[PDB]
Amino acid sequence: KPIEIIGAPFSKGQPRGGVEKGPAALRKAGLVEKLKETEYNVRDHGDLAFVDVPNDSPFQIVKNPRSVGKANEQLAAVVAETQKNGTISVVLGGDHSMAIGSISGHARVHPDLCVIWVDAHTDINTPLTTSSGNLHGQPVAFLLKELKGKFPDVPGFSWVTPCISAKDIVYIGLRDVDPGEHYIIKTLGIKYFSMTEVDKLGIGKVMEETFSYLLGRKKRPIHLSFAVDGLDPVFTPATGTPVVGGLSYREGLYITEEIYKTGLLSGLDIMEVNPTLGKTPEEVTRTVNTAVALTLSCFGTKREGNHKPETDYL
Amino acid sequence: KPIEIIGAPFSKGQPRGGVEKGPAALRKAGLVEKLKETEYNVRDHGDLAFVDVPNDSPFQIVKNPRSVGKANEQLAAVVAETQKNGTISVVLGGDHSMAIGSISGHARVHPDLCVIWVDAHTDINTPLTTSSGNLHGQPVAFLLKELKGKFPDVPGFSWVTPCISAKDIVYIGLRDVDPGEHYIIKTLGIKYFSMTEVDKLGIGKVMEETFSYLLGRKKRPIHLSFAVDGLDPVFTPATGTPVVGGLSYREGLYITEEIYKTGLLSGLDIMEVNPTLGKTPEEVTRTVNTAVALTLSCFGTKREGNHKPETDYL
Amino acid sequence: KPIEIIGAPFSKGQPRGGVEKGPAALRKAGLVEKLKETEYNVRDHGDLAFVDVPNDSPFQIVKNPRSVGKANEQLAAVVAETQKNGTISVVLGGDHSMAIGSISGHARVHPDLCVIWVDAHTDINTPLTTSSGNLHGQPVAFLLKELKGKFPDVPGFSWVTPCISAKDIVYIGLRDVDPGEHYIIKTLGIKYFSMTEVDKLGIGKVMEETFSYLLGRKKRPIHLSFAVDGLDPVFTPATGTPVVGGLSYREGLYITEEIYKTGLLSGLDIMEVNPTLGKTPEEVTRTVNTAVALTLSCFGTKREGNHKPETDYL
Ligand SMILES: [Mn+2]
Ligand SMILES: [Mn+2]
Ligand SMILES: [Mn+2]
Fold it and tell me: Which positions does the record annotate as the modified residue N6-succinyllysine (chains A, B, C)?
């Protein structure tokens, strides 16, 4: 099976600059070369060139609506393509607004897909509920079918067609949710496991419950939108929106090791990795290194070990 | 329902100076202002003025017996007062000796109360078993009915009347217990969950078991005596008696989110927060921040989120 | 019952120098004096003097085969002795190659023994599967009966006689296994709990399953070969082969607390503690301190507390 990797030097989804360097940061650390040592076939696509929309005035509160919408449209297009050729799309981020295009492109080829969102945030603010006009904290609002027409049409998101319903998404890691966001996820009855749920059940039982919720009836393609700020900052400090008391480096991997076992992984997102936000070159190393580990785990690497089939090591 | 904050800038309960600054450290960080943003009514009572008893000679081993006893008597008086007006008392500490007055005052209005003690210590040394004459490590001995008359009358603790029995208290966090204490908690058959028990059962099951032990038969008021040294030092380093391998920031909150859910919280203690004991202004920030978080969690703030009733955010 | 500490200041099992200082580092911190405060009888045997084999040419890839083999032979001899006198052997390491002599000597007196290996590695590379000729990463290959004759005779292991079978050993902590090693442990059907398994089940349930596997039928002597690198580096940083996402200081202790409870502990290994590899004197303090704690836990010290029998503390 195919692994094609995307690259998405974007940063307008939020205020802090540096996230667009992420892709480079992940490749710098040899992400691709390591991925080729796996049982998979790896073809690096390269980094997309995002055309900057001039005079990108704010839409009410929202910032960079046109620039963001145009980048995602461009991403959804590439992702949809590769996915059409039956390959697995690994989108190396910037900010988490690129989820929009990353998932939108995926649902074109596999509309029955499901989404496992590992972030410390729900990122489900409608342009009417954000306190800041930042788009990396709204990806899901533009994707939810139940949220269609609950807010005005944002410039450049005309092409966006709500592709997933409340029933096809599950959050993991939640620890920072606004009043607005919480409302929505309580009203729409979305399935989540906030840190409190991970404490009570154990990452082990949480994976059991999410796999029987999203996969209990029909087996469908799995789209993992992972941000780095889903783990405690003590593991992923080089991020723009760290929140204390997050998933451990161990739970992080466990989540990815259990997803590889389903053989249903179809789309992946390694988002929000910001190099310039590390307080020491070390913190950067740390973050990147665990971002690479999470990835590789998604494609086979187990903590127990790996040996090549048919090779008698004795 | 009412919330009445009570400063108690005391420090004679132990050797290290700095704990009396705790109240100011917690207010400095905006504890009260944050508490008012909750569904509760907040009235700050202010910091008590503790009269220093001159020529406070030691009683055998015990130090500052008269000074300590007089402060607590003064505290038990205020707490009893506010509790008489049906309000929830939040005692912002110094040292943990103030538990004496904090609880003694509470039992005057609600004698059937129960106590959940989250510390890494049992603090149950009778003036005959301490190796150091420090009173913050004996609070419980003066409160336990079964320990009445097992040690000599300490100067200034004449007014103290044992209010709770071995059956109405539960420890969580234990990790440093002396030979004497352990003897006692084993003899009196007190219910506890030392770190080993939290490892074996999971904070989730521990709360289940403590709530069915103290609340299984009769629903009674809950008085939470929380210290900061109940969490691992990597979370609450600005304390005088840190002990490694403690409760995580996550378990800490879980304990408090489960207590809010009982709607039975009646008295609270945020003790032992020492600002001058931080090795970097950061460690102080850290400690205080998590001390504020624990508090807020006791009164509603959930990690999943919060939205105001009756407000249609759409 | 008897305790006899055995220094083994060895380091040829690997490249990085400093591990031979371990013994001294553990004694420096008062390991022995602390052990005598327990209900056990402690007799320090002293540190063994390892004779250095001249012109110790490599055997193919393997390095220092003769020097290593001669030290272990000398160790297996002392351990077998004290075990003959019905005492518990606590081997203070260097590198983990000394496991060979530590266990080999133990099986002479108690052949039906079992082994609980807590490391982040399987240390089961046959001189044909190592990528580096390092022996601390092969101890188990020389001990396994099923691995007899699967590799050439290494100079100085003539004396080694495979004493335990695949069925008598259980790993805990695994997180870094090569292709070769993983093969073997999958082929020989060895029982293990890699970090993934500890995440899924909980250290509590893991102990339950290792004790019913290796002990469910016949009760036999327990040989605990512990390595420091089995815990996350944030606890045991002063080691030569740290690997992230390991057992916590809490799980580490739980493992040792449950083993004391079996009253079946017969042999113990506190290996790989390297003083010179600490980035700050603190990191060294840290590591050593937790290495001492694990030890003491193996012989009684509980996190809940300890009181002397027959002493009425009141
Ligand atoms: Mn996000
Ligand atoms: Mn205390
Ligand atoms: Mn080892």
Answer: 12, 70
Residues in a beta bridge with A225: A117, A269
Find tokens 């190396």 and name the residue. Answer: A92
Contacts of A41 (CB under 8 A, 6+ apart): A1, A2, A3
What is d(CA B228, CA B283) in angstroms, rounded to the nearest whole number? Answer: 13
A1-314 is classed CATH 3.40.800.10 = yes
Bridge partners, B92 (sequence order):
B7, B270
Distance, CA of A73 to CA of A160 (rounded, Å):
8
Q: Alpha-carbon distance C240 to B144, whole Å? A: 51
Q: Please, are residues B236 and B287 in contact by the beta-carbon 8 Å criterion?
A: yes
Q: Which ligand is nearest to the CA of A94?
A: 1
d(CA A172, CA A247): 9
Cα separation, B293 vs A242, in Å, equals 16
Q: Any CB–CB contact under 8 A between C55 and chain B?
A: no
User: Collapsing DSSP states into helix, strand and coil, what is residue C90?
Assistant: strand
Q: Which of residues 180-239 of B touch A (CB under 8 A)?
A: 202-204
Q: How far is the CA of C143 from the centre of ligand 3 (A)?
A: 14
Tokens of C286: 């840290």
Among the listed residues C128, C112, C77, C120, the one whose alpha carbon sits nearest the alpha carbon of residue C98: C77
* Cβ-contact C173, C122 below 8 angstroms: no
Q: CA-to-CA distance for B191 and C229, rounded, in angstroms?
A: 35
- Rounded to whole angstroms, the Cα distance separating A252 from C303 reads 29
- Non-local CB neighbours of C49 within 8 Å, separated by 6+ positions: none
SS3 C257: helix
Distance CA A16, CA A12 (A): 9
**C197/chain A closest Cα distance in angstroms:** 9
Give the gyration radius of chain B's Cα atoms: 18
CA distances from C221 to A84, A111, C92, C114, C164 (A): 60, 58, 19, 6, 12
In the block, residue with structure tokens 């992420």: A22
Return d(Cα B3, Cα C105) in angstroms, integer.
67
What spacing in Å lies between the alpha carbon of C240 and ligand 3's midpoint? 10
Residues 6 or more apart whose CB falls under 8 angstroms from that of C229 comprise C119, C120, C121, C236, C239, C240, C241, C242, C243, C246, C272
DSSP string, B155-212: TT-SS----B-GGGEEEES-----HHHHHHHHHTT-EEE-HHHHHHHHHHHHHHHHHH
Query: Domain coordinates of chain A in residue numbers?
Result: 1-314
- Separation between Cα atoms, residue B259 and residue B254, nearest integer Å: 9
Experimental method: X-ray
Give phi and psi for B61, each to the nearest 5. Answer: -105, -40
Q: How far is CA C281 from CA C238, C275, C287, in A?
A: 10, 9, 10
